[PDB]
Amino acid sequence: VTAITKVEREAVLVCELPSFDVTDVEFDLFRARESTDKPLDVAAAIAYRLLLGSGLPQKFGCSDEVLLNFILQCRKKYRNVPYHNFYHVVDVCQTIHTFLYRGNVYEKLTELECFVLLITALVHDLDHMGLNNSFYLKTESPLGILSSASGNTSVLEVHHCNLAVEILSDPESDVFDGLEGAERTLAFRSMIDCVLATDMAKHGSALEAFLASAADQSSDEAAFHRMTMEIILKAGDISNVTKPFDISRQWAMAVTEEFYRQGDMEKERGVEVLPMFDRSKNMELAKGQIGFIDFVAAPFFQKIVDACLQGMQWTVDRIKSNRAQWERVLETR
Numbered sequence: 001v002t003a004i005t006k007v008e009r010e011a012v013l014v015c016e017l018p019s020f021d022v023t024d025v026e027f028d029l030f031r032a033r034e035s036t037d038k039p040l041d042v043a044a045a046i047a048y049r050l051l052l053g054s055g056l057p058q059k060f061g062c063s064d065e066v067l068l069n070f071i072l073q074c075r076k077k078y079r080n081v082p083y084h085n086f087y088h089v090v091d092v093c094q095t096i097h098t099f100l101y102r103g104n105v106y107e108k109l110t111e112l113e114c115f116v117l118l119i120t121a122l123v124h125d126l127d128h129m130g131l132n133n134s135f136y137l138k139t140e141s142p143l144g145i146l147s148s149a150s151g152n153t154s155v156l157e158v159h160h161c162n163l164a165v166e167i168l169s170d171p172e173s174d175v176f177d178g179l180e181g182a183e184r185t186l187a188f189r190s191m192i193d194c195v196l197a198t199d200m201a202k203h204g205s206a207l208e209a210f211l212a213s214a215a216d217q218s219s220d221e222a223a224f225h226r227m228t229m230e231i232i233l234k235a236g237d238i239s240n241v242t243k244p245f246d247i248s249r250q251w252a253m254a255v256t257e258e259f260y261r262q263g264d265m266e267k268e269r270g271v272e273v274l275p276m277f278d279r280s281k282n283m284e285l286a287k288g289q290i291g292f293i294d295f296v297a298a299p300f301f302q303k304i305v306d307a308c309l310q311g312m313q314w315t316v317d318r319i320k321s322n323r324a325q326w327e328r329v330l331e332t333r
């Protein structure tokens with residue numbers, strides 16, 4: 001990987017972020033993108049500011065310049081797609097910060113684990129192309145074959161891990177270079193385990209395992225910590241519905257357009273197209289958001305909050321409020 005030139009760096013540094021509190025649950029990344037003509041610069045800045053503010057790269061020997069380089073190396077690896085672009089991962093990062101620090105989830109983990117989660121947010125969908133794992137396996141693409149012959153159906157996640165390891169293997173972008181022995185090993189391993197757990201095919205099993213561990217007073221402690229990390233990155237990944245309605249709506253539009261584009265390609269190549277990806281059906285956004293809420297996100301947040309993450313109660317409340325708003329849209333249709 002080519003090095004991060006100083007103007008690249010300096011450009012991110014000049015962003016000022018006035019009128020924004022990045023630690024707030026109502027922080028609005030869409031507004032931040034619109035507030036200047038270099039949104040990719042402002043996004044980077046939000047991440048940088050989040051990490052320095054936590055107090056954590058400092059404690060694990062990661063300097064500010066390495067921190068920036070890492071972010072910028074991650075950024076160059078994000079494509080221009082509607083949803084799975086760099087803003088999604090910065091959003092996941094900032095959202096995770098709120099879970100740890102407004103939701104008190106920090107109490108369940110070590111400082112290193114908190115540091116790892118914030119970093120892992122930025123790598124977790126590196127080089128995403130707007131196409132889901134299913135696409136690669138249907139069209140027998142190289143990545144699909146490679147994953148399949150390697151023994152792992154989590155096509156993109158193994159890909160994102162491979163690239164995260166490749167970025168951290170360069171010392172000018174190694175945010176974990178100041179760690180040693182068991183700590184270094186733990187950061188790599190937990191980072192990887194977290195990104196592999198974002199595959200939604202494993203959603204049910206990762207949720208059941210966390211729940212089972214949280215209910216058991218004699219759970220292996222190390223194991224509980226890992227699963228809590230995995231669940232928190234999962235939580236950030238499906239956190240669009242826990243945000244203020246207008247934000248949530250904006251995310252929904254973006255993911256919908258990405259899904260549609262995949263469907264367009266699937267038609268071209270002749271493979272099977274599901275209705276959710278079919279632009280020639282035009283379901284309403286509301287129904288699609290209500291279904292995601294009822295089948296995936298409300299039970300997930302409700303369950304983890306009740307199991308042991310009591311501080312995240314606002315996620316359940318906002319999901320409830322967002323659902324009602326979507327119902328209201330349909331009720332006055």
Ligand SMILES: COc1ccc(C2=NN(C3CCN(c4nc(N)nc5sccc45)CC3)C(=O)[C@@H]3CC=CC[C@H]23)cc1OC
Nearest residue numbers: 198200237238240241248251252255288289291292295296
């Ligand atoms: C803003 O609104 C959204 C944001 C993200 C997604 C995602 N969706 N999925 C899938 C999840 C399982 N899916 C569903 N499962 C079940 N049981 N019910 C239902 S109802 C409708 C869907 C559905 C299909 C999509 C992904 O894997 C993406 C990659 C990683 C994390 C979340 C991403 C989806 C959004 O809104 C639909």
Ligand SMILES: [Mg+2]
Nearest residue numbers: 124125198199
């Ligand atoms: Mg992903």
Ligand SMILES: [Zn+2]
Nearest residue numbers: 088124125237
């Ligand atoms: Zn993601």
